[PDB]
Amino acid sequence: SNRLGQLVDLTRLLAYNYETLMACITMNMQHVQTLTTEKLQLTSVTSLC
Amino acid sequence: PAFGMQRMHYRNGDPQTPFQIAEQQIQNFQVANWLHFVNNNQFRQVVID
């Protein structure tokens, strides 16, 4: 709750950088699950948040 | 947090300082009159002697 405004700003910043880099893509980008994944420890979220 | 509200959603360059916006959101005569005085406290320019 005390980090609310920063969370809003973070969300907007991720969305902006994401679409900005999406702009620089040539091969169509499909939504399909994969064999191997990428780990994401939630402590790396809590830190970011 | 005392009157049980959201934290705030305050803009950097908001044309109102936080006491001005908070003067009207709350409902309590004492605190609101205090904030009124604070927002409208300013010097009196008077030419003497």
Structure tokens at A16: 């902006």
B39 with B17: CB under 8 angstroms?
Answer: yes
The length of chain B in residues reads 49
- Beta-carbon contacts below 8 Å between A and B: 7
Resolution reached, in Å?
Answer: 3.3
Subunit contact A2:B9, Cβ cutoff 8 A: no
Q: What is the DSSP string of chain B?
A: --S--------TT-SS-HHHHHHHH---HHHHHHHHHHHT---------
Which residues does B contribute to its contact with A (CB < 8 Å)? Answer: 7, 9-10
